[PDB]
Amino acid sequence: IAYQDMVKQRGRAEVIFSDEELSSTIIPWFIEAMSEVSPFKLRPINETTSYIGQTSAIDHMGQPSHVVVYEDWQFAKEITAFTPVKLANNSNQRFLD
Amino acid sequence: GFNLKVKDLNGSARGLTQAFAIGELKNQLSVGALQLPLQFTRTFSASMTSELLWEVGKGNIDPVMYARLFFQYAQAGGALSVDELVNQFTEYHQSTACNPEIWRKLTAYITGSSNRAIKADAVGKVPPTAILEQLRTLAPSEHELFHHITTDFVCHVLSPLGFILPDAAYVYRVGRTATYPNFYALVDCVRASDLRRMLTALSSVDSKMLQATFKAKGALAPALISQHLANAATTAFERSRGNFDANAVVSSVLTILGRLWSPSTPKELDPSARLRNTNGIDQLRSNLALFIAYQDMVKQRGRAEVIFSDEELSSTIIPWFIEAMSEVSPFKLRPINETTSYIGQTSAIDHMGQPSHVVVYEDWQFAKEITAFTPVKLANNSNQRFLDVEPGISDRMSATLAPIGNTFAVSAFVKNRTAVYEAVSQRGTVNSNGAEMTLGFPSVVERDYALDRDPMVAIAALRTGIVDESLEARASNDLKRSMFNYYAAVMHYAVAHNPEVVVSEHQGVAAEQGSLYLVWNVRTELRIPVGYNAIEGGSIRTPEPLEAIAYNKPIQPSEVLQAKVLDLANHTTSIHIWPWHEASTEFAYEDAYSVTIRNKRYTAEVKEFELLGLGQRRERVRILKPTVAHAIIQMWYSWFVEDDRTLAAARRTSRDDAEKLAIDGRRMQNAVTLLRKIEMIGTTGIGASAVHLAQSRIVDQMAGRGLIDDSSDLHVGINRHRIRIWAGLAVLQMMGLLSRSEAEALTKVLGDSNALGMVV
């Protein structure tokens, strides 16, 4: 999907052409870059959609009249209410009681 | 790209006439027949194509380096003249170095107290950067140079090595310089060697015994050395005396060189054979730069006077004029054969044939890279910065730079220039107003783009030979300085190919004295369309260097004269910096493509960061002005516009029905070459990025307002060619290559003639 996005905005893709050699040896580190640092960490595609449900309405035969896709979410538990306290002026440093 | 009709110079280019230079603008022109000869072996020329980073040392107070930098500061951007730059330093140096209050203040600032004085074997080293931090508050000078030059004086006298930690890295940019020594530039050279002796006085055999006096027997009480250094720097100052007035030096040394060049050496005084024998005066009377400088001086001054310390003095004092010129100056002495090495010449022809079109050019190589940097301040109120060069912008533009170099190379320029001028059924002629001559000199134009001037205003002044008296001092002075660099460059090439020449006096207007001028001789073919001269015998005598150049034969240039990139990457990443700001530019660009589709107009806006395909935008980064590359393209531009201008008024003044069908020929013809060139650039890393952005935003605009189906028309022939030209003009603008003002006058040209072949 990232590819689709890029080519939509860029309209071309150009290469450093240091390959066939370079980026096969340097870099895989693109892999390392994506694996460790990022919030996006790699998952099996079966388990990425686990929270998604689907349900159909129906007619007599029948074809669906109404189909609803959802994410099962649980509400609550608490709503925290805090009062900020400044230790030193000019800074965002705070205790939150 | 300065184009001229060789026949009438007074009409075509007044600025390039020698008669102009010696100050006769009257209908009378210099008389081809007069007296005494001469041969030029050498001249003074500066360096082309050099971008260098110069570290300023631990110590050591390099007395030449500083005096050189002074020139580079006064040159690469205007600050007065290097003369005024010097007596500003002397005033500074007096206000600082002779003042004991100030010496007390900084000796106290290092350690330990303003009052109490302690030998203090405990006290450790101190950073030079910290001494400069103080100096910015103590002696608030505009030119931060001054703070270093005094600084590493103290680090020179402060090095038992205890108190000074010799750790800092500081660098300066030595860039392109105007090539040839204007009269007042000479005065500036003498004035810089005044600085050479000034500094070599500071670092001394007696500043070094300061190490050896207090080396015994060890560390001593500080309160002393404040009064000692103050007298130490004064002795260095009081010893270097103004002595000889630098103007009076140059005035009188050139004046006598004027006396032994001239065929009129009057009754009263002609040079002594003793001073005639003085070493180097042989290469002095044979120096070309010194001659055009004479012309310069006597044009402005109108007389030449002597210090009259001669006959003796200037045989003994000075040769030192030589010393000033030898070492300090960027103008270092060269053989006149090797000075014109980058200049070629090529002629078009008719059947027989005489040259129809003659092009003089400088071989220049483009590219390689274009650097983009973001300045980072270490300390406020100072121009001290690290410059982090951030690539991927530099690489991206440099990628688009390679194809511009191919399509705009000077080689392609001279190729496409010769083949245009031909007319139906040959034969010539003196008709069309004769044999045109065009000469590009990016070396000269680069100066104007470097000094943030319109090259076209200097160019205009050449043709007319008159300047607007209203505009401010620095403005005209930058113009005239540039206007000289043209004439200077001309007579260097002109003489380099015909060294045997004759000097002759002028009648005079008063007549008082007179100006010495130059005449050439050259042998050639029978019939001359070219500007009036005999030619009488297959050889011809001429005063004007253009006529002289027109008669030479095609030339192969010896050297490539490749312009080089400055290296920010390796150095500046770890180091502090020079006067960078006026030499760079804020990096931001906006442009917009508009078009009409089915009686409705859509417009897309585009920004610089979108063009390099990134987000969002970084405003802090800047681009180093690629002044040289711009000057090369100018040569192209200056042709297109200026030819179209004269060709338009040519068609109006042409009554003949047969002549006009020829004029409109050259017009549409080279106009499409301008089209094909730009259209090519419209396809590039940027060019394609631009067209893509523009087209996409229009369709996004077309989905909303109605139906999309009209977008099929964007892919039709004319619109496709339209959008491409725009991208091409936009990319050139978004690099240092096209002023919005000049590209506008280009668009007008492409539209003045319809200049669109549909071509199926």
Protein architecture, described:
Chain A: Homodimer. Associates with the polymerase complex. Chain A: P1 is the major inner capsid (core) protein of the polyhedral procapsid, which is responsible for genomic replication and transcription. Forms a dodecahedral shell from 60 asymmetric dimers. Binds to RNA and may be involved in genomic packaging. Chain A: This is Major inner protein P1. Chain A: It is found in: Virion. It is classed as viral protein. Keywords: major capsid protein, viral protein. This is part of a larger assembly, with 2 copies of chain A. The first copy, chain A, is α+β, with helices and mostly antiparallel strands. Helix content of chain A is about 20%, strand content about 15%. Chain A contains 3 helices and 4 strands; from the N terminus they run αααββββ. Chain A has helices at about 1-10, 20-25, 30-35; strands at about 50-55, 65-70, 85, 95. In chain A, the strands form 2 sheets. Chain A has a two-stranded antiparallel ribbon. A two-stranded antiparallel ribbon of chain A has the order 3-4. The longest helix of chain A has 9 residues, at about 1-10. The two termini of chain A are about 45 Å apart. The interface of A and B includes residues 9, 10, 11, 12 and 14 of A.
